[PDB]
Amino acid sequence: SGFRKMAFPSGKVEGCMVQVTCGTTTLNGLWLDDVVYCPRHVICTSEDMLNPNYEDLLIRKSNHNFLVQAGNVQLRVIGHSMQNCVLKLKVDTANPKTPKYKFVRIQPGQTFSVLACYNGSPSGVYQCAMRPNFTIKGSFLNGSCGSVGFNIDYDCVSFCYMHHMELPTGVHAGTDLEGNFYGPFVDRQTATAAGTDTTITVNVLAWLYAAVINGDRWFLNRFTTTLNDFNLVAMKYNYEPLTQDHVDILGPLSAQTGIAVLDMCASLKELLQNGMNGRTILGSALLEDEFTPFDVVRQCSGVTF
Amino acid sequence: SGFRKMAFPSGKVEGCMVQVTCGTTTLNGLWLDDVVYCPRHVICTSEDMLNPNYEDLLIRKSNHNFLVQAGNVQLRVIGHSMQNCVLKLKVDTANPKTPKYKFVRIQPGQTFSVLACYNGSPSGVYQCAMRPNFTIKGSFLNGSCGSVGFNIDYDCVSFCYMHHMELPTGVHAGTDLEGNFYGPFVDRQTATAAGTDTTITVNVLAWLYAAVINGDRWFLNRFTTTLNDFNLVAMKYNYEPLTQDHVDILGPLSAQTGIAVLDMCASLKELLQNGMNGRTILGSALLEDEFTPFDVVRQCS
Ligand SMILES: O=c1[nH]c(-c2cccc(Cl)c2)c(-n2nnc3ccccc32)c(=O)n1-c1cncc2ccccc12
Ligand SMILES: O=c1[nH]c(-c2cccc(Cl)c2)c(-n2nnc3ccccc32)c(=O)n1-c1cncc2ccccc12
Ligand SMILES: [Cl-]
């Protein structure tokens, strides 16, 4: 029993983190096979960050301008290229600790484990969700760029996030590993801000199932709802639409608890309309929305990697 | 910016996790140099657990009755010894991935990371605290025993917890890596009562400082309190007393923010007495008590 913010074991990713230095800037890179991936703004001075044309800025660099430190060994850079916002440094040595891996782009609401690093060295690991407004509520200090987010499935690490920037309100923006930012954010100095956010409905439902699995049941009720009737209520409370796919993905939790998804939806409807009336669910006084259905299954069923 | 329940990277501990089988029971062990540590109740059946004579039960076991597997590689046990409530299984091979390590016994209120494992393989990693009643609010299923808690103190892995049992409350109890239980719990079936779980006041104050560092300031006020007067309000609300040592440990955060510790006590006093009035602090509608002062400094600077 129990339910915690639970990250994937991070060892497979730790073995891939390196330090990348260009000029007076140091940040983190991800070393997979014979390529090191890092944010392309490693080549930028703070002065460069205004209307930068990265094609100019990168042609003014050579291989010897990049210093890649992998523990006690210096990897020699033998080529470089950029894939949209991600710089790819070709090195002379394939990382012998490369895990089985994929690059995936996740959807708003999906979660991942962040391995926060400084100077190529892992510092901590925590869970994040990609918010509907395409930010993440991370914990990142100066020097954390190039830290990555990932999920694991069996023996395969699926990298889905590379950290690039902090926004004015203290939330974070970054790219997938193929170099495309999540959301309208850009690796240049602009006066932009995160937009209005919403609550990830399918995740709140997953977490209510986690609560039932752990014995917290006070919020259940006798009612059911149709999917459309639920969504008419959800929109009023700034919740994301629940799709039929979300209902399907919640199936395993419904089977394990015996509570139909639309029955859970009626429970959530009543919590939104009445509040929690001083009670708590899994130690929280708010409805938690950064556990996916799979996060609940992997934790409550003891999946290993 | 930002503030998250952050665990230490688990890779150094992953390299020490092994599977330990005795009879039909499989749980986890910790492989350091040529020794594997695991809960001694691995040798018990559920019927043995009703009234176990661990000394007699261990005498009856042989080295070959302990099956140890590191990944898909089998290790041969060449000795077995009581270590309070854990077993030390001597094996043929020193673990080549043994990190620099020490065994530390932690204090109530201190935090640590847990690598939850099943059958010798890792499931996930999370942060938790040793509660004032010497339980931990973990996430553990059947088969998780032998999973360990740890901190990474600079150049060294500090192992502080090995998991042994879930109490009827759904919270968890275990030993340090010397095999001595935290709290009054025992590795046998009892009508074990758990003490009063109280809130870790020094940690709540640390987390309020984290909130100010991150820009949440609405809860500060111009009232004042003495330490004794604050502590009277604290235990009214089932908070632990705040000691002079706690005040000094909050020194670095009070210096960074410019807010005296007793002035933050005045803020916490008002929050306890009036509530939050529908506002949140660091994304929470409740006061968080599982970040130590050290956790906040580590994460915020
Ligand atoms: O580390 C970083 N480096 C840089 C940086 C980029 C280029 C050159 C240089 Cl010299 C630096 C960041 N910038 N700055 N302007 C940007 C504009 C668009 C994109 C990224 C940007 C940045 O946001 N972060 C940070 C990341 N996460 C948390 C942080 C907390 C506190 C301070 C910085 C944090
Ligand atoms: O895995 C475990 N194994 C055993 C066990 C011990 C001896 C023999 C056998 Cl055959 C089994 C546990 N027991 N049982 N009585 C005990 C009495 C004192 C100490 C430990 C005890 C135990 O509590 N746990 C568990 C640990 N954490 C979470 C759990 C969730 C759900 C079920 C079990 C959980
Ligand atoms: Cl809360």
Numbering used by the authors:
A (entry chain B): 1 to 305
B (entry chain A): 1 to 301
Quoted passage from the original study:
Compared to the binding of AVI-3318 then, the uracil core in AVI-4303 was flipped ~180°, albeit still anchored by the strong preference for isoquinoline at S1.
Proteolytic processing of the SARS-CoV-2 polyprotein is essential for viral replication and depends on the action of nsp5 (1, 2), which encodes the main protease (MPro), also referred to as 3C-like protease (3CLPro).
